[PDB]
Design a protein around this ligand. Structure first.
Ligand SMILES: CC(=O)N[C@H]1[C@H]([C@H](O)[C@H](O)CO)OC(C(=O)O)=C[C@@H]1O
Length: 358
């Protein structure tokens, strides 16, 4: 077809109530509405800043966006509370939407102490907001205790963006959301948090790697779950691991030289999420990140047609400043992209024809 690439800002620093906006999360409701979530930052900083989780909705495929509404409101007055780094997760079977995020008080990620008590202001808590009405109203839950099987895990945070629901195998229906934890030795590890009962209970899998950070997972054509991670040890590339199970454990972590990265968040999705297992279309992956190894710039989309082995097609969508980016498959066959150009958060829409390879 004919190449399509358009973009418009959803939030710009200083307008609509907050001096700074950051951290994109994007998803599509079962009704087909597009939901964009991000941080509203009063002091322009990460947790423990008294941040708010915000949301904008589009009912016409991303063309027009409704007003900025608050999902979780931070408290700028003492007792200070903050809510940051959103990640959406839609249970396509039940139609339920989840929005995972941090619940901070006195500490952020690096400073969190061990503990699980919601009342303890020294721990960085894990929260989930649940909606059964398409993202209109939300019910909140602190699940730190449920996802901390090892008392030595002193900190954690859901990787911002969008999680997944498995379609194949013995664990089909399973909701997976990635987290980064800091263990007793001070090591940064990746871990899958999942639910087999459509969100009633959440539990952690086995932690993997060292030098890990914000990480994402995708279900491959054979049902294997590929983990793609930001490298906190700064190799200049993305780290990768694979899981063949559901009681999540991942194999060894290796550096992927095909994916340069300056130690920043990225997104990896299935181009055709509904394709049947083993089919050619099920092997197609899209990846968005900053390709520069020296700075957060040169935002590009890469495409693989072999479950992530090779990435023969790539195109730059933002030559300049580009930090965090997330992708989702829209029902019209195109792709939504929420990203950070340095001025707040911007929404972009593109199709495969635009990519050039196919
Ligand atoms: C909970 C939290 O702190 N999230 C932040 C995250 C984290 O600090 C880093 O991943 C090192 O672990 O990094 C950044 C960043 O732009 O680099 C922004 C996130 O809001």
């Amino acid at each position: 077809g004919e190449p399509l690439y358009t973009e418009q800002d959803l939030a710009v620093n200083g307008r609509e109530g907050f001096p700074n906006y950051r951290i994109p999360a994007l998803t599509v409701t079962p009704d087909g509405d597009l939901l964009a979530s991000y941080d509203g930052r009063p002091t322009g900083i990460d947790a423990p800043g008294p941040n708010s989780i915000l949301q904008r909705r589009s009912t016409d495929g991303g063309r027009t966006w409704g007003e900025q509404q608050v999902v979780s409101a931070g408290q700028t007055t003492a007792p200070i509370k903050g809510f940051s780094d959103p990640s959406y997760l839609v249970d396509r079977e039940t139609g339920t939407i989840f929005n995972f995020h941090v619940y901070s008080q006195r500490q952020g990620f690096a400073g969190s102490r061990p503990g699980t008590d919601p009342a303890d202001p020294n721990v960085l808590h894990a929260n989930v907001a649940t909606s059964t009405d398409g993202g209109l109203t939300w019910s909140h839950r602190t699940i730190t205790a449920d996802i901390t099987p090892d008392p030595g895990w002193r900190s954690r945070f859901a990787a911002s963006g969008e999680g997944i629901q498995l379609r194949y195998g013995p664990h089909a229906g399973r909701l997976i959301q990635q987290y980064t934890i800091i263990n007793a030795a001070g090591a940064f590890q990746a871990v899958s948090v999942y639910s087999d009962d459509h969100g009633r209970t959440w539990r952690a899998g086995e932690a993997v790697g060292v030098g890990m950070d914000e990480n994402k997972t995708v279900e491959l054509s054979d049902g294997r779950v590929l983990l793609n991670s930001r490298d906190s040890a700064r190799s200049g590339y993305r780290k990768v691991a694979v899981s063949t199970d559901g009681g999540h454990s991942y194999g060894p972590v290796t550096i992927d030289r095909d994916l340069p990265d300056p130690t920043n968040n990225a997104s990896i999705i299935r181009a055709f999420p509904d394709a049947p297992a083993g089919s050619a279309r099920a092997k197609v992956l899209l990846f968005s990140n900053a390709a520069s190894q020296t700075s957060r710039s040169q935002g590009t989309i890469r495409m693989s047609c072999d479950d992530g082995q090779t990435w023969p097609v790539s195109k730059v969508f933002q030559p300049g400043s580009m930090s965090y980016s997330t992708l989702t498959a829209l029902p019209d066959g195109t792709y939504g992209l929420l990203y950070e150009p340095g001025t707040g958060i911007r929404y972009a829409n593109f199709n495969l024809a635009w990519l050039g390879g196919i």
